[PDB]
Design an enzyme around this catalytic site. Structure first.
Site, PDB file in Angstrom:
ATOM      1  N   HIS A  41      -6.736 -20.388  18.082  1.00  0.00           N
ATOM      2  CA  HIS A  41      -7.651 -20.158  19.203  1.00  0.00           C
ATOM      3  C   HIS A  41      -6.949 -20.255  20.559  1.00  0.00           C
ATOM      4  CE1 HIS A  41      -8.594 -24.326  20.504  1.00  0.00           C
ATOM      5  NE2 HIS A  41      -8.955 -24.635  19.276  1.00  0.00           N
ATOM      6  N   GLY A 143      -7.803 -30.520  25.533  1.00  0.00           N
ATOM      7  CA  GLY A 143      -6.347 -30.452  25.510  1.00  0.00           C
ATOM      8  C   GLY A 143      -5.730 -31.075  24.258  1.00  0.00           C
ATOM      9  N   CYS A 145      -6.356 -30.265  21.094  1.00  0.00           N
ATOM     10  CA  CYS A 145      -6.219 -29.361  19.963  1.00  0.00           C
ATOM     11  C   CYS A 145      -4.752 -29.212  19.584  1.00  0.00           C
ATOM     12  CB  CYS A 145      -6.820 -27.997  20.251  1.00  0.00           C
ATOM     13  SG  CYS A 145      -8.550 -28.055  20.789  1.00  0.00           S
TER      14      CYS A 145
HETATM   15  C1  LIG Z   1      -8.317 -28.068  22.475  1.00  0.00           C
HETATM   16  N1  LIG Z   1      -7.218 -28.253  23.078  1.00  0.00           N
HETATM   17  C2  LIG Z   1      -9.460 -27.763  23.418  1.00  0.00           C
HETATM   18  N2  LIG Z   1      -9.543 -28.159  24.683  1.00  0.00           N
HETATM   19  C3  LIG Z   1     -10.694 -27.709  25.180  1.00  0.00           C
HETATM   20  N3  LIG Z   1     -11.326 -27.023  24.231  1.00  0.00           N
HETATM   21  C4  LIG Z   1     -12.632 -26.322  24.355  1.00  0.00           C
HETATM   22  C5  LIG Z   1     -12.443 -24.791  24.238  1.00  0.00           C
HETATM   23  O1  LIG Z   1     -11.330 -24.415  25.023  1.00  0.00           O
HETATM   24  C6  LIG Z   1     -12.085 -24.277  22.840  1.00  0.00           C
HETATM   25  O2  LIG Z   1     -12.193 -22.855  22.831  1.00  0.00           O
HETATM   26  C7  LIG Z   1     -12.335 -22.189  21.605  1.00  0.00           C
HETATM   27  C8  LIG Z   1     -12.427 -22.887  20.419  1.00  0.00           C
HETATM   28  C9  LIG Z   1     -12.566 -22.188  19.238  1.00  0.00           C
HETATM   29 CL1  LIG Z   1     -12.657 -23.135  17.749  1.00  0.00          CL
HETATM   30  C10 LIG Z   1     -12.648 -20.810  19.184  1.00  0.00           C
HETATM   31  C11 LIG Z   1     -12.561 -20.104  20.366  1.00  0.00           C
HETATM   32  C12 LIG Z   1     -12.388 -20.790  21.567  1.00  0.00           C
HETATM   33 CL2  LIG Z   1     -12.294 -19.864  23.108  1.00  0.00          CL
HETATM   34  N4  LIG Z   1     -10.530 -27.054  23.107  1.00  0.00           N
END
Ligand SMILES: *[C@@H](N)c1ncn(C[C@@H](O)COc2cc(Cl)ccc2Cl)n1
Ligand SMILES: *C(N)c1ncn(C[C@@H](O)COc2cc(Cl)ccc2Cl)n1
Ligand SMILES: [Cl-]
Ligand code: NA
Lengths: 306, 305
Positions: A41, A143, A145
């Site tokens: 993602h 952040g 992920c």
């Molecule tokens: C992970 N680092 C993180 N930080 C903030 N977020 C929230 C969104 O940015 C996550 O965006 C998505 C998640 C998924 Cl599973 C699919 C598509 C998108 Cl744009 N995540």
């Protein structure tokens, strides 16, 4: 003696964490040999929240669209491919700190350490369990992920989890390192909800065995139970069924304490009925379910405090 | 979201742990620059453990009586001396993995990460607090002595604890890295007992703030209190007194959540007086006192190392 939620020492994993940037999105990646693993993602834009076509988004990227930073050093991306929900970025340097490792997919009830990371830099380490509903109860901010979960039995790091997202209830979902989600979740920002969660029965039993090993017997009783009657009662408190495999797995703890598994089951039944009546077990006023049988044997004395 | 008992990443300390053997005793040491630090009780045998004369035990030893292994490499000991209850073994090689570090002595209530080790090999990491009675509630087996506790403040490791022994209640006692015990304990195998412990009030309040930040709010109420009235309640329930300094330290969390400290004290008062009435807070049925204010802010903001 003593009993704590204990993580693996994190240094072997700290040496693998990097930062991955694509566009305005930065998250973490895992650098092993000459490959960086991260959530696919990272390639999504604001428009791609609900129904991303990852194949179509990825074909439009070149190697040099991915920025990978390992400490202060840029790595050069020389290839990319997607496997399930993870991106694999081939880089021009093998990680000199790559530990002995493997990728393992775990079952619900299994525990692992999480190294929470931001911008490729480790923040903290804690222990988690894969819940029966295939979520984890972690501590993750924006952040985070691409943070990973692992075990280190011996000198070999078993990577079992990569963090992808947070569900509306505040619990967490992710993949194995082959990019397959745990549970029915998808990497889309559509309405998804975790199923009702249940208590991990075999782990509670393990923890009661830890309590006996550390010298506490107050909750035992003179009764026994059949496996079927135990399961009939335990299900009424939202406990997972106990299987014969679970009973077998508890054999060593049984042997060490002299308490038959079905006798420990009878103790658990009474605890569910009575609560703790002002008492604690290993410092807790609730029944703890995030220690496995293997965790208890690893942490506790092999000599019971009688 | 979420809130977990979280240790510092341990890798900077892992690279400093070694195995120290003297006679039939093996335990752990900390290798920084060209010195290995470990508990002086490594030089004790069975008949000495009751009333050791450490001076007299040590004078009998040569450098080569101490075997130090860093992984699979023997280090050469070229000197030995004692500082308080720690032994300092001078070795011929500086540890190339020595991090930026300091030795600090912490105060009761402060938290730190413990890297439990056996035979110089790190086995696990967990978070502890120095209790008001100067024990820690750790998890340690035979061979764990010389395991260390630390914080990381930037890129600098602050070493604050070295493990020496277990008391009869199953709690743990040790020293700072200058070898001064935390608490009224001595390094001998004798009748020693922990004092009665108390609950760390400022840390419970911090954790209640963590709960509110994570959306758990049922215990808030319309009431406030004064420091003096609350302190009468604290004393009744075996809680540490709350000072104005504690109130100041919680200031941030007060501002962020809109719950003044004395307003949160009125919540805590009611919990102590009435219990939780079947409810939980951040998954606990007891009030947790091993998160500091700084711990709560650090985890509800994502600081890294
Ligand atoms: C992970 N680092 C993180 N930080 C903030 N977020 C929230 C969104 O940015 C996550 O965006 C998505 C998640 C998924 Cl599973 C699919 C598509 C998108 Cl744009 N995540
Ligand atoms: C620490 N590595 C460890 N492992 C086992 N034990 C128990 C005994 O060996 C303790 O021995 C002593 C402790 C003190 Cl505090 C003084 C003297 C002795 Cl012999 N500790
Ligand atoms: Cl009022
Ligand atoms: Na109030």
């Amino acid at each position: 003696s003593g009993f704590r939620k204990m993580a693996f020492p994190s240094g072997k994993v700290e040496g693998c964490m990097v930062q991955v940037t694509c566009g305005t999105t930065t998250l973490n990646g895992l650098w092993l040999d000459d490959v960086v693993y991260c959530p696919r993602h990272v390639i999504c834009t604001s428009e791609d929240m609900l129904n991303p076509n990852y194949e179509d988004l990825l074909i439009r990227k070149s190697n040099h669209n991915f920025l990978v930073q390992a400490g202060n050093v840029q790595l050069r991306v020389i290839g990319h491919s997607m496997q399930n929900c993870v991106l694999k970025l081939k880089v021009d340097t093998a990680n000199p700190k790559t530990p002995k490792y493997k990728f393992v997919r775990i079952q619900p009830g299994q525990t692992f350490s999480v190294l929470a990371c931001y911008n490729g830099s480790p923040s903290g380490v804690y222990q988690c369990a894969m819940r029966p509903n295939f979520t984890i109860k972690g501590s993750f901010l924006n952040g985070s992920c691409g943070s990973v979960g692992f075990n280190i039995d011996y000198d070999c790091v078993s990577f079992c989890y990569m963090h992808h997202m947070e569900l509306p209830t505040g619990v967490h979902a992710g993949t194995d390192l082959e990019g397959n989600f745990y549970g029915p979740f998808v990497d889309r920002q559509t309405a998804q909800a975790a199923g009702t969660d249940t208590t991990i029965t075999v782990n509670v039993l393990a923890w009661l065995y830890a309590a006996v090993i550390n010298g506490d017997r107050w909750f035992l009783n003179r009764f026994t139970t059949t496996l079927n009657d135990f399961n009939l009662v335990a299900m009424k408190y939202n406990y997972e069924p106990l299987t014969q495999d679970h009973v077998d797995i508890l054999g060593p703890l049984s042997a060490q304490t002299g308490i038959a598994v079905l006798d420990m089951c009878a103790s658990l039944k009474e605890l569910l009925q009575n609560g703790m009546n002002g008492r604690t077990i290993l410092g807790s006023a609730l029944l703890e379910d995030e220690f496995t049988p293997f965790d208890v044997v690893r942490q506790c004395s092999g000599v019971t405090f009688q």
